[PDB]
Design a binder for these strands. Sequence first.
RNA 1: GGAAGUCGGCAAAAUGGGAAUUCCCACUGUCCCUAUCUACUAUCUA
RNA 2: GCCAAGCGCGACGUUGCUUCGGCUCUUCCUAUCAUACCGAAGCAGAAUUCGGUAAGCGU
RNA 3: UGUCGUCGCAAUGGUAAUUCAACUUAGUACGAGAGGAACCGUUGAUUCAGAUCAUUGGUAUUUGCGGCUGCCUGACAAGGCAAUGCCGCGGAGCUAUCAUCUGCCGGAUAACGGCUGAACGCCUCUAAGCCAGAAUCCGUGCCAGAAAGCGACGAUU
Lengths: 114, 239, 225, 132, 35
Amino acid sequence: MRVHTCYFCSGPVYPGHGIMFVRNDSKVFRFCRSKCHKNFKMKRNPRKVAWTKAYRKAHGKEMVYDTALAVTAARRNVPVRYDRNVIATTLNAMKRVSQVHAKRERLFYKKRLA
Amino acid sequence: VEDITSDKCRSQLRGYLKTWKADVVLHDGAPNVGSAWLQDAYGQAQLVLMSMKLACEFLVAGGTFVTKVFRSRDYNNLLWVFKQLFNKVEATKPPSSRNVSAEIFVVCRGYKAPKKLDPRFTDPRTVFEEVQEPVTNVDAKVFHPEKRKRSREGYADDDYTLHKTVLASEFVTANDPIQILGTSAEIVFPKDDEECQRLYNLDVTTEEILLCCSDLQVLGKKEFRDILRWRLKIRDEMG
Amino acid sequence: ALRAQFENSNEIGVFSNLTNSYALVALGGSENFYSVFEAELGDVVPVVHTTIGGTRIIGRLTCGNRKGLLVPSSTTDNELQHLRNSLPDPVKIQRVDERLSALGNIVACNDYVALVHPDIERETEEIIADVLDVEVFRQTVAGNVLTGSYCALSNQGALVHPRTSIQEQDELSSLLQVPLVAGTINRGSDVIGAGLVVNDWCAFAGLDTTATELAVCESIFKLQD
Amino acid sequence: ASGTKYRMTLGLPVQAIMNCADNSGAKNLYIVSVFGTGARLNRLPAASCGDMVLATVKKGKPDLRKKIMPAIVVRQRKAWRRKDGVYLYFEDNAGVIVNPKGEMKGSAITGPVAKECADLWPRIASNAGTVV
Amino acid sequence: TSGPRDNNRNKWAKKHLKKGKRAKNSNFSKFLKKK
RNA sequence: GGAAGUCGGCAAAAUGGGAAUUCCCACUGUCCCUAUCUACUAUCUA
RNA sequence: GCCAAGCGCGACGUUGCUUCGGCUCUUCCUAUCAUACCGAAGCAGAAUUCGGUAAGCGU
RNA sequence: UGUCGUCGCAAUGGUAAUUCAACUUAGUACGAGAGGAACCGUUGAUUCAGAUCAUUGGUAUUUGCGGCUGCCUGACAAGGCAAUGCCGCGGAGCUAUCAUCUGCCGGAUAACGGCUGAACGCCUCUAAGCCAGAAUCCGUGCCAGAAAGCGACGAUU
């Protein structure tokens, strides 16, 4: 159960939603909706499309990074042994990261408005 | 009552031929219907060629071979073999032959009487070998990310990995960027190449251009034009 | 050597993966196939009743040795975690973001030396060297790039196409530092990797493998004693 | 064939020319008949990923052409829904030349391999390079 | 193959019902029933 | 998907093209297999 | 023709060579191709052959 | 049927599911070998039927938003336009084996296999009797509800 990121909108793609597209280079494009899928079909550049996350990232409208709580998430290809206490701590860690990430989400907007 | 080209019947034909030699040969090879037209067309054409094999074996100089053929794309190739192996070609449709069908009677008169039957002609692989055409209009694909025109020819002539990559130095130096973009999946920028390292450090090259080269396939007409203008500027810089 | 069959399919190599420290079998199918492996390796190495990417072709989709295991990037997270729980700790498990997800089909690896696909990515080769701790050779088997499927490789023996030349046979055996035999399995099935799985002490062949082929693999593998 | 095959959207009807993905030398496959077609009135038989159909080699070697003989579809243009809910579609309609037993005549394939085709045909999965 | 009105199949369906299959169903009703 | 429709490329889209009525290529709701929209008709009222 | 129970015929037997024409459609019939169940056969098994019940359901 | 309404009853009429191959039983029964079953159980898929719109595709008069061309206000801007000018996206609705769900149980028989058992001191599946038994038959279930079939209940100008 993985919530993937759309190639175009960089938004959350959940099971059932959107489309998955495989290229001859075995590379997989997942689209959150038909609008993003068609935009890939006309091959519009995400950074050049005004509403995409890639545009909002590489135009100064969103933060380069946030090491909130020194870590937020990562693509871990090495599986980890289960532990109830560890699975507990990360869940508390996740909400703490989200709250702090929400905190910077507000100051930065104040900075841009200023 | 035997096969047309069997070794035994060929012995019987030459057994009756004796001092005489085959002057005119008629052929009415007719495969059954009930399959693809292309299958039936090639089934008739191969049976014509493979029956044309026994002809040159048995035919006298200046002989005539009248055979029924099914018109197809291989029909032009079959006429070519007829032209080299016979002096005159008389492909025609008699009034009695049904016009709705492709029964064409080719009269190959004036047998060339070659010294020996050419192995290329004997072998159907060589005769019906698909002849390559001029370079595919890959510039149209470059200029038009749209127009999905049902491309169906093969897979780049036995190309195992379709993710073809082209060196940055090779792409810049080459005089045919249109075919590079049309054929290559991406313009690779390996770190080992000293020229590629120069290309990264070049002020003209930008992050968008690097992203465009990383994924050529997901690019519009304007992005391709910008890459083409970029490579020309690099070419102007080198000389 | 033992004759085993998955359902009515003799290509047990496709539906299961065998190593020198663990065994991999499909999920949700006939329990007889898992029991066959358990009867011969249950008390030796753990056997994992798992599937990859929701597929029963885990044998040809996964590549690994007795130390480590590799799965394609298409492997689901739930499948990846399930492998870690079942497999023991000294067995590393690693994902591979490769253009060719058929890792088992493209890489034929034993515990010590591995032969990989000629077009395998450099990052994949680095990951193989890190996790498998094996020397990686980029070559081909009998002129066919699918080394993992056209070559059955073990510590004390290897099997390749019967069409390979003698000098190619000797060169491959010298490179693989192992005795190697050019032969066929499953009564003419030239895909030895698909029809044969062998560890360092036992071999498993398809139910359609001839007795002559069974005698041959036992002799080259020296597993009679 | 090994194991049951789930129903998926059909997008390769008869009278279709499709790309031949193996290294046997064939280029274009022409669909003439589809195995396992019921008596449906005025319905064109159709093919999907992993389905075996009678195909004729339009382009390729003269020797293997003129054989109406089964081919397994490995990639389908039309979007189809996997039972997990996600939708997939490939750019090209790719098929592999196979004997009735279930073994590919060629030695290697080109392009991604649909997983549904891979699980259905173990020999195809054995000869597959990228199962996506 | 026979349909759903096959007499032998209806016999076999009874044999499923006369075992824990219908049983599991009875107390499953009893649980929500005593609720 | 691409003439598999029908006695048949009739009408559309393609631009229609190439080669000897035929073949090849392209094209399309002709067909699989229909679905949606619009105006008018149709309906009721004086 | 030979017999020939019988009532000159004479049964069964026996000898003698020898305009029409087809698409869709609706139902219906069984004189049943398949599906369901039985019977017989040197029917080992498997695949059949033949014969019954049978028009529910397809073709 | 006082009147109106609610909740039901059910005479009768229609009916619906079809077929396949995969797992296990198996490489067992059986077979010199070659080969190779089936029942129970299980999973899918065809044809058909009844629905449905979560997801996907299609649809565009949402004339919803944006872009382009041209036109009109002296200019800028501002707008408005153009038989629905052109293009992209587009909810909502409709819709698609281009998407998804669901598709039931009792007896009674035919062929046939028998039980007891006379006729006929034996025998006999049959005469009187009785079991087993077909996708068959009749029910169940599902659809309608007699607009001159009916019940209980509520209140009463």
